[PDB]
Chain A
Amino acid sequence: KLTNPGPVPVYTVAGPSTARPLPDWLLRRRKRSAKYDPENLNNFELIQEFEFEEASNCVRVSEDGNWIMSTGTYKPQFHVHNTRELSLSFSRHTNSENVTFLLLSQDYSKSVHLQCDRTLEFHTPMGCHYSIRIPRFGRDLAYLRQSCEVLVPAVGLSSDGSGYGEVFRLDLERGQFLRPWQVDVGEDEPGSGLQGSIHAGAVNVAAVAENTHGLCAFGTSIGTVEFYDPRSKSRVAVLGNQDGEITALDYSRDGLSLALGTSTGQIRIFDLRNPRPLLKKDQGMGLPIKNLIHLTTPTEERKLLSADKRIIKIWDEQSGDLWTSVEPLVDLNFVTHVPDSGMILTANEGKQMHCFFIPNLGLAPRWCHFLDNLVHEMESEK
């Protein structure tokens, strides 16, 4: 566990130390053969077996906050950790490298994931209910909860009817594929296969509010955000012609402001009624941004940015200034905060899935109590 910046310190309590680590086999040979002397005090991990040995894809934390589900790539699996028991509860293999997973229950008792071989897989504790193939390739996943329906965006343009583009939406009380919502993606080559072209033709991100009204927002590769209203099942708005692909999409706690982002690396915080951007920030380099979420240090509101330059930037919302910047030293593919405060679980490319602790953002969560005493010890040592 280290401390990267001066003013607002970040703490990488768990995570890889090196950018290019060797084979674990050679590391074990060296450790059991030669003489070593490691920093035994501050070197540890907080959750046993928090790795995958090849890479990682996605982390989420349950609504109850007792279950951490995390997928990894080789022998493509997902581990589930009982965070009260601070260890690996189980580890289940699959047939291909997971793209995106969403939990359903407040515990881990039901999960689903869009999976690289064009599949939706449904996991119980008892096992794995039979997967459903979707016709066209997937990009992300969302779940209408007030009316149970999982919906995936897809790349390419539809088969017949129109040439708009599709978000496959199937209900769970009904079971069938209801209907792909018609979302225009852009013009394609007429001489092409059914799985689109290599340059464009993609819907990327879906995001839905679960406590406010819930406008189903979709983001398309020509930089175009659309809005569908549930209980109407039709298009409401089209806005935001941007230069980058729309890859960022999340609502606020009130249910009014949206924050979307362009793969040049430019975030725009919009209102749902004022088409002028409420806030604009171009940041980092040309590497495409990946994820963004609102969060409140319980007095003040702030915003996450995650992009694969090893850059995560916590911005302010009421001012726009940069609060904190963190360089995760390796690639990273997903970010999540614990719902309590202060800890950011980050899925990466490296072996060890790494989490950050901001003391100025919040306290240590209800299952690692001594992490505050550990930051305490770091301020003792420095």
Chain B
Amino acid sequence: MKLNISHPANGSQKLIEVEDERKLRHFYDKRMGAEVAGDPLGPEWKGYILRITGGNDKQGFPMKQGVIAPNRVRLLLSEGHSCYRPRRDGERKRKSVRGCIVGPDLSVLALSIVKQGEQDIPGLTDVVHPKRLGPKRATKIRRFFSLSKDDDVRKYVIRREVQPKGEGKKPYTKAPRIQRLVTPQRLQHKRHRIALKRRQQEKVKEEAAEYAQILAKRVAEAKAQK
């Protein structure tokens, strides 16, 4: 039963081969999401606690959160559920999955370190993995960087450097096109919008007044006929 160990804070992960079901025995009959200490696992794992988040048993079936059958079971998955992507829209498909009950017939267990211990897993917690992309919209950049009102996200955005082809040319920077950034063109867009509103209401006021004097004119002519 190999364990896919993931440190979500540091953003790292590693598969670990595990023999000795006598060592693994504390995992049995534990639901997905249950907190379990790693002190029974290894002497390096002193002071750690980890949650489980699923896995795959033999014959390769996923493990869906929220099913109490310990064996392999046969659900009917709709669109927005796990362990299924819809082929077409509005599709409900019957698929077989393994219930949340961690039994002996599993093959990989997805485990996530939530509180570390005093010792360090060598390939897991020492290695940091950054986030791939920084924030793009202006307000989220502002919340990320704690900037003031005068502090210019245009010059405080994240930059990334690459090298192009052409036999080692100059390095080349890249910037993520800040979305929620107010520009004079946005200002003129809103201004032209309300200008269209007031111009239309001005037009209907003018035409209503002219129809008022034309109806007074035609009623006066009809009464002069009468």
Contact = CB atoms under 8 A, between A and B. Distances in A.
Interface of A: 40-41, 44-46, 48-49, 82, 85-88, 367-371, 373-374
Contacts of A87: 73-76, 94
B74 A368 contact: no
A369 B70 contact: yes
B66 A85 contact: no
Contacts of A45: 66
A92 to B, nearest CB: 15
Contact of B68 (A41, A49, A82, A374): A374
Q: Chain B: interface secondary structure?
A: loop
B3 interface: no
Interface string B79-99: 000000000000000100001
Q: Chain A: interface secondary structure?
A: loop
Interface of B: 29, 31, 33-34, 65-70, 73-76, 94, 99-101
A10 B31 CA distance: 21
B82 to A, nearest CB: 13
B73 A85 contact: yes
A357 to B, nearest CB: 12
Contacts of A367: 69
Contacts of A370: 29, 31, 68, 70, 101
B76 A86 contact: no
A88 B29 CA distance: 25
A48 B66 CA distance: 9
B74 A85 contact: yes
Nearest to B29: A373
A86 B64 CA distance: 13
Given A87-B75, A370-B68, A41 B101 contact: no
A248 B23 CA distance: 57
Nearest to A40: B33
A44 B69 CA distance: 13
Contacts of A82: 74
15 contacts: A40-B65, A44-B67, A44-B100, A45-B66, A82-B74, A86-B69, A86-B75, A87-B73, A87-B74, A87-B75, A368-B68, A370-B29, A370-B70, A373-B29, A374-B68
A375 to B, nearest CB: 12
A49 B66 contact: no
A136 B74 CA distance: 43
Contacts of A368: 68-69
The 9 closest A-B pairs by CB, nearest first: A44-B66, A85-B74, A370-B68, A87-B75, A86-B69, A86-B73, A41-B33, A87-B76, A368-B68
A374 B30 CA distance: 10
Nearest to A376: B29
A373 B73 CA distance: 19
B73 A41 contact: no
B65 A371 contact: no
Contact of A48 (B31, B65, B75): B75
Contacts of A44: 65-68, 100
Nearest to A46: B68
